[PDB]
Amino acid sequence: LTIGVDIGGTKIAAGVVDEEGRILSTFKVATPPTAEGIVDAICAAVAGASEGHDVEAVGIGAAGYVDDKRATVLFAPNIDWRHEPLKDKVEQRVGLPVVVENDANAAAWGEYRFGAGQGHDDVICITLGTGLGGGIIIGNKLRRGRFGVAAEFGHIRVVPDGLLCGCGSQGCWEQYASGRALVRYAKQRANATPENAAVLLGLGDGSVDGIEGKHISEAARQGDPVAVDSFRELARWAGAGLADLASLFDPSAFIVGGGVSDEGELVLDPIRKSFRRWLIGGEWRPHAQVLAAQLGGKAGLVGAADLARQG
Amino acid sequence: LTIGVDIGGTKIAAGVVDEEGRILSTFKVATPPTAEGIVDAICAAVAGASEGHDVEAVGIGAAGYVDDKRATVLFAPNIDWRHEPLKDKVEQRVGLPVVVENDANAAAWGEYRFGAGQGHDDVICITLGTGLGGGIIIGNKLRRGRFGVAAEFGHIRVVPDGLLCGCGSQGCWEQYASGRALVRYAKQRANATPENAAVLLGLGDGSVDGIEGKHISEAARQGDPVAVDSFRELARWAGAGLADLASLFDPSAFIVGGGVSDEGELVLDPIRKSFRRWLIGGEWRPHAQVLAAQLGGKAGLVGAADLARQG
Amino acid sequence: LTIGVDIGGTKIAAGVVDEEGRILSTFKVATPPTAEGIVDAICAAVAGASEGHDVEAVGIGAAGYVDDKRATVLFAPNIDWRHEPLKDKVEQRVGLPVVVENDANAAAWGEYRFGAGQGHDDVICITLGTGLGGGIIIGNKLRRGRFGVAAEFGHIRVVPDGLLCGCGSQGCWEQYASGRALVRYAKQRANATPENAAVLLGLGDGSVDGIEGKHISEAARQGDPVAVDSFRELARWAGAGLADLASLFDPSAFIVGGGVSDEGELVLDPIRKSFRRWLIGGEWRPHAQVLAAQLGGKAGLVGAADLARQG
Amino acid sequence: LTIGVDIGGTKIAAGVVDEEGRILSTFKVATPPTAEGIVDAICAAVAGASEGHDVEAVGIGAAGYVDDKRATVLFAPNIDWRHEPLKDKVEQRVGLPVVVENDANAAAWGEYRFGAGQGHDDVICITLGTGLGGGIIIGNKLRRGRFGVAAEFGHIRVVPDGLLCGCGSQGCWEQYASGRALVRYAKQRANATPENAAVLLGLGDGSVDGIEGKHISEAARQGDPVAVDSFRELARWAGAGLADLASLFDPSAFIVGGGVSDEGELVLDPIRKSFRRWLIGGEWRPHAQVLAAQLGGKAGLVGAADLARQ
Ligand SMILES: [Zn+2]
Ligand SMILES: [Zn+2]
Ligand SMILES: [Zn+2]
Ligand SMILES: [Zn+2]
């Protein structure tokens, strides 16, 4: 029995989780803008979620690069952590041992252990959020890398001299296949051909900026030409990438979750269909599966809890 | 005590390799023009290399996708081989256990176990030649992939819609970081500004296309502006690539070898400099060493012989 | 009243064309393998077509860089002409006044003066064949540029570090927007997803290699999915580019034509839809029309003739 | 005898320009925040400059898409203007006839008629500022295009699915060869190897983001390895471009001017050399000349002036 925490931009969330990934308790606080308030909000959230239960360790999913010690947040893009010991600060204050994991590595292990990855051995997970993140599992282990920063798939350059990424470099995959990307793609199309977007503009404020990640997903189901076109474009870079990861890792299966994948096979099919249409030498090689995530949002919590059991 | 085989375009070497990766007796045969005759020449070579030696097992470097069961060449670009059961074929006609490995994988592992990898756990190898290829070690074991076809690095797409590649896909990395690329960039630069290739051209037939691989590594070490600056361009693509593999697996070390690196730190240093510059991170995330391969060309032969002791 | 010449690769055709651009007599002659044999063959052609006809001039469509004096082929890619004085040669030997033009320019002028171009002042014609080619008409004149070599739209570099081109460069538009292109796209796709290209692979010989341009323009209208997707890919590069010519010259009408446009609204339409999708200034700038090319094959001859009317 | 006007984010300038492009007077008014106020400050500036002189017309340098009718500003990326009838509004409030030109096109014509274009026919002008803009001259006539929005070189896509542009499409040339681009390249390379940028970080504030356009040109003329390498990187894209315009227009000359070129052959020689390294089939074809722009900052103003006489 253990507790996991997903540190998710709007809300932090803690929970007591059994050996089969069942949430016995949830508790949530509004994420702080500050640096040190996160530690304070985390313990607050641990102490709320423990709720009488006899807890052994605590695993935290932080959105940022976490080290190979599973101890420190090396760098987050938003929140100012400079080599900040998060294990050390929280261990001394909730008494119990702590382990810190990359946010998506948590999700990755979450889906693999209790989700769509059950009964596979070699598995790559992607998540399509505002950005694009993931994790590896090879041989039944999470693979952090030697320094702890492995599978930062979002910043594999896809387009040289590409778009400015939120990380510094240009052309990162995260700027072409993601929730950010999707919206760019809508707006671009939307601006040129306003007519073939009457159902999609009719959802926001009517004007070319009122477009949001939700508006597209729905506007597409009702087949709004521009909406569905923006999924193709996404599906493209999405699939391209999967094919590149397929060339490098050759998994049994990719497991695509994310906010924009909790939409279903409106998105998942085109990407599976792009992947196939972009994989190399498929004639001779086995095609990996492109499965969707089962645990949706919960992944990282459960992932983190169970990752807090490993040595 | 075990034999390794390296199936070269010109010639097929079969050597006896000991526990410590030491070639005790190489033996050679010419590479016939047929597909089916190669299987004879492999046996012919394993015959003669094996004279008066207590041999246990035999590994084969295959220039194509090898499966996970390590027994068939699924597809080779230059040998007419399709689902060709090289293992069963040779196992039957030599009388000793056989494994078949990807040629890139053998050399990757050969370097990891007896070469430049010693004392590392997570390692990614590249070798630059006509092409680009390599292998992966994560946690002390070669990682072939779920289906046996991993680390086909050569073909991670680096330019969308880019240069035509021999795997039939546009924009692979092989096309930009490889002896073949090196040459292209020289031919372009030399043709733009002939005045700076006073030395480089003099080495070939004084002509526009005379340039060949060797002539550049010669012209470079002789401080020739075009030949030194072609290596700068090969560095950009080579490094930028490693920086991306650094995001995927984030190893403790890249090991960079093959024909193009035989020329030494003239080639490797500007790469190491490119790698550092393209690396996503900054001064928080630590850098993976870029080491020179030690076992030169014998990598494939040696490493194959060791992969013959696995399971 | 005047004769034009279409220097076809398998025959040479001289034609008598009136003030209203309608062909009277037409005399063809085998294309010889020798360079000056084409001169000889042009003169024979000219003679044979000028039967009891009051002929004033002879315009000649040459597929090379013609100069500003409309006289020398400065370079033909196939014919061995370097600085050939084709105007003075052919004048001397047939007694009539002569003028030489780029073959795309003849096509361009023909279509502006006798096709989709009528009632427009500023117009840009693109003809999609093995390559791309075109011509500028601005202020009702053809615009050869200072040195003669205007309008080589084929080789304006759309993908830096892209595809090696006949012109000797990488990433030229020609390689992305043309027959040669469409076919890549089909082959890449068909080999990726055999299942979907079942009609396309029928029309040829079963195999990926057996695919040919005309088989796709058919397999499309029967709605073969691979063959349509390949027409999307083309329409993307063709429109993307048109929208760049639109930002350069800002014409009243583009006129897309030549081999893979004479197929019709199967193609023009997606292009027209892809030009609007990529045009910048959606809501403010009027949209230039995308018209289909009325004269088909004929144009080169008809334009050459009529360009002979002035200087 | 006529009046040109130059509408610039900091100041508007309206001068009197004779037959040979010579400025005889110059008046200036600070540029107000409203769209509806620029209208007035322009009237103010023409009234201020037409002192004593017999002016026959006004030409106006609009920083935005102007139409074929030389009368409307269809959209400006800064000035809040949509289908603004600037010609009519001004004509009626000064009493002299007015024409409204694209600002790049004003500049082009000025340079072609009075500066480095002297004695050419087919000529393409590029000005290299915060962004890249320009104008096309073919057969001694500025070419505005069918709808007047022609010549907009800045936004030919050089890198597909590339950098975000201020027109909202990705990849535009403006994002790769321009004052802004120059800044980015400087920053990137000094962040990559600060040791070769000691001289340049000095001129700024020791710090990677304190880098600005002026700082770099000075750092290069003191041979600062990074400032130079960042004009190499500007040259690469600047020529590649000029090379593709060579392919389209084949002019007798490109005239490269504006903010970044103010620095001279330290910038143009890299470019002039890149243009050659990217020109298609340049042993058969004749090469266009790359020439330094003569009239510097004034071109737009002189240009607008003469464009009021065509
Ligand atoms: Zn990034
Ligand atoms: Zn490839
Ligand atoms: Zn070309
Ligand atoms: Zn733009």
Three-state secondary structure of B230-282: HHHHHHHHHHHHHHHHHHHCCCCEEEEECCCCCCCHHHHHHHHHHHHHHCCCC
**In this complex, do B121 and A146 lie within 8 Å of one another by their Cβ atoms?**
yes
Residues C128, C178 contacting (CB under 8 angstroms): yes
Chains interfacing with B (3 or more CB pairs < 8 Å): A, C, D
- Ligand 4 center to residue D129 CA distance, Å? 14
Ligand 3 centroid vs C65 CA: distance in angstroms?
13
Give the C-alpha separation, B59 to B64, whole Å.
Answer: 15
Which residue stretches of chain C are H helix? 35-49, 86-94, 103-114, 179-192, 200-203, 213-221, 225-248, 268-278, 299-307
Cα(A152) to centroid(ligand 1), Å:
9
Rounded Cα gap, residues B292 and B261, in angstroms: 8
Distance CA C248, CA B177 (A): 35
β pairing state of D98-102 and D58-62? parallel
Closest CA to C140 of C306, C5, C3, C24: C306
CA dist., res. A106 & res. A77, Å (int): 18
- The binding site of A for Zn(2+) comprises 155, 165, 167, 172
At D120, list the tokens: 């050419």
Beta bridge partner(s), residue C26: C15
Q: For residues C68 and C311, is the Cβ–Cβ distance under 8 A?
A: no
Look at strands D82-84 and D73-75 and give their pairing.
Answer: antiparallel
Closest CA to A6 of A36, A35, A56, A49: A49
- Number of cross-chain residue pairs from B and C with Cβ atoms under 8 Å apart: 25
Is residue B39 within 8 Å of B80, Cβ to Cβ? no
Residue numbers followed by a gap, chain D, C–N over 2.5 Å: none
- How do C134-138 and C123-127 pair as beta strands? antiparallel
Q: Locate B80 and state its tokens.
A: 């007419």
Residue C105: left (phi > 0), alpha (psi -120 to 50), or beta? Answer: alpha
Residue type (1 letter), C227: A
Compute the distance between CA of residue B23 and CA of residue A161 in angstroms, rounded to an integer. 47
Q: How many CB atoms lie within 10 A of CB D202?
A: 14
β-bridge mates for residue A75, sequence order: A65
Tell me the CA distances in angstroms from C7 to C14, C33, C61, C102, one per residue in order. 9, 13, 6, 11
Residue D99 CA to residue C185 CA, distance in Å, equals: 49
A85: buried, middle or exposed (CB in 10 Å: 19+, 13-18, 0-12)? middle
Q: By CB neighbour count within 10 A (0-12 exposed, 13-18 middle, 19+ buried), where does B262 fall?
A: middle
Q: What is the DSSP letter of A136?
A: E
- Token pair recorded at residue A17: 């989780």
- For residue B4, the number of C-alpha atoms closer than 13 Å in the C-beta half-sphere is 31
User: Would you tell me which residues 137-176 of chain D have a C-beta closer than 8 angstroms to some C-beta of chain C?
Assistant: 138-139, 141, 143-153, 155-160, 167-169
Residue C23, classified by CB atoms within 10 Å of its CB into exposed (0-12), middle (13-18) or buried (19+), is middle
Of D45, D21, D20, which is closest to residue D31 (Cα–Cα)?
D45
Distance CA A109, CA B136 (A): 21
Tell me how far apart the alpha carbons of residues C239 and D23 are, in angstroms, rounded to a whole number: 45
Q: What is the C-alpha to C-alpha distance for residues A226 and A182, in angstroms, rounded to an integer?
A: 11
Whether the CB of D275 is below 8 Å from some CB of chain C: the reply is no
CB-CB: which of C192, C273, C278 is closest to A277? C192
| C182 three-class SS | helix
PDB experimental method: X-ray
Q: Which two tokens stand for residue B254?
A: 């890249």
Q: Measured between alpha carbons, how far is D306 from D58 in angstroms, rounded to an integer?
A: 9
- β-strand D2-7 against D11-17: which pairing, if any? antiparallel
Please state, in angstroms and rounded to a whole number, the distance separating the CA atoms of residues C27 and C52: 13
Q: Both tokens of residue B215?
A: 């002539």
Q: Do A162 and D159 count as a contact with CB atoms less than 8 A apart? A: yes
Min Cα–Cα distance to chain C from D198, Å: 32
Give D 172-201 residues with CB within 8 A of chain C.
none
Q: What's the Cα-to-Cα distance from B121 to each of A146, B309, C84, C291, rounded to whole Å?
A: 8, 19, 67, 63
CA separation for the pair B134, A248 (Å, rounded): 10
- Give yes or no for a contact between C84 and C34, defined as CB atoms under 8 angstroms apart: no
Rounded distance, CA C90 to CA B121, Å?
76
Beta strands (DSSP E) in chain D are 2-7, 11-17, 23-30, 58-62, 65-66, 73-75, 82-84, 98-102, 123-128, 132-137, 142-143, 253-257, 289-292
Instruction: Give chain B's end-to-end CA distance (angstroms, integer).
Output: 16
CA angle B249, A270, B160 (to 5 degrees): 55
Task: Count how many Cα atoms sit within 13 Å of the Cα of residue C13 in the half-sphere of its side chain.
Answer: 20
Nearest residue, CB atoms, D192 vs list B160, B161, B277: B277
Chains interfacing with D (3 or more CB pairs < 8 Å): A, B, C
Distance CA C281, CA C62 (A): 37
**Alpha-carbon separation of residue A133 from A127, A186, A253, A257 (angstroms):** 5, 22, 16, 10
Q: Measured between alpha carbons, how far apart are the two ends of chain A, in Å?
A: 15
The pairing of beta strand B132-137 with beta strand B123-128: antiparallel
Distance A167 CA to ligand 1 centre (A): 4
Start-end of H helices in chain A = 37-50, 86-94, 103-114, 179-192, 198-201, 213-221, 225-248, 265-278, 299-307
Burial class (CB in 10 A: 0-12, 13-18, 19+), A233: buried
Instruction: Note whether A145 and A68 are within 8 A (CB).
Output: yes
Exposed, middle or buried, A277 (CB in 10 Å: 0-12/13-18/19+)? buried
Token digits of residue B49:
């290399």
Contact (CB, 8 A) for A106 and A4: yes
Q: What does the alpha-carbon distance between residue A271 and residue A265 come to, in Å, rounded to a whole number?
A: 9
DSSP category for residue C11: -
Tell me whether residues B161 and D160 touch, CB distance under 8 A. Answer: yes
Strands C141-142 and C134-138: antiparallel
| Cα–Cα distance, B148 to B70 (Å, whole number) | 7
Token duo for residue D257: 């001017």
Please name the residue of chain B whose CA is at the shortest distance from the CA of residue C208. B168
Pairing verdict, β C289-292 and D2-7? unpaired
Report the sign of the C-alpha dihedral through residues D76, D81, D87, D91, in that order. Answer: negative
Chain C, nearest residue to A277 by Cα: C192
Q: How many CB atoms lie within 10 A of CB A231?
A: 23
Ramachandran angles phi, psi of A161, nearest 5°: 55, 35
What is the β-pairing status of strands A132-137 and A289-292?
Answer: unpaired
Spatial distance between the Cα atoms of A40 and A87, rounded to a whole number of angstroms? 13
For residue C279, the chain D residue with the least C-alpha distance is D169
Domains of chain B in start order, with CATH, are: 1-119+293-311 (3.30.420.40), 120-292 (3.30.420.40)
Q: What is the resolution of this structure in A?
A: 3.2
Look at residue D149 and give its three-state secondary structure: coil
CB B237 within 8 A of CB B271: no
Question: Which residue, among A83, A247, A274, A285, would best test binding to B if mutated, counting the most B CBs under 10 Å from its CB?
Answer: A247
Q: Which residue has the tokens 């730190």?
A: B265
How is residue D309 written in tokens? 């006489």
Chain-centroid distance of CA D286 in Å reads 26
Q: Tokens representing C264? A: 């019709």
End-to-end Cα separation, chain C, in angstroms: 16
Tokens describing residue B216: 């550049």
Distance of alpha carbon A150 from alpha carbon A137, whole angstroms? 11
Please compute Rg for chain D using Cα positions: 20
CA angle A10, A11, A12 (to 5 degrees): 135
- Judge contact between C304 and C6, C-beta under 8 A: yes
Instruction: Copy the structure tokens of residue D300.
Output: 């737009």
Q: Which residues of C fall within a CB distance of 8 Å from B176?
A: 161
Give dist(CA C311, CA C98) in Å, integer.
Answer: 11
Quote the CA–CA distance of D274 and D161 in Å, as a whole number: 24
3-state secondary structure C58-69: EEEEECCEECCC
Q: Are B240 and B274 spatial neighbours (Cβ–Cβ below 8 Å)?
A: yes
Give the 3-state secondary structure of residue B197: coil
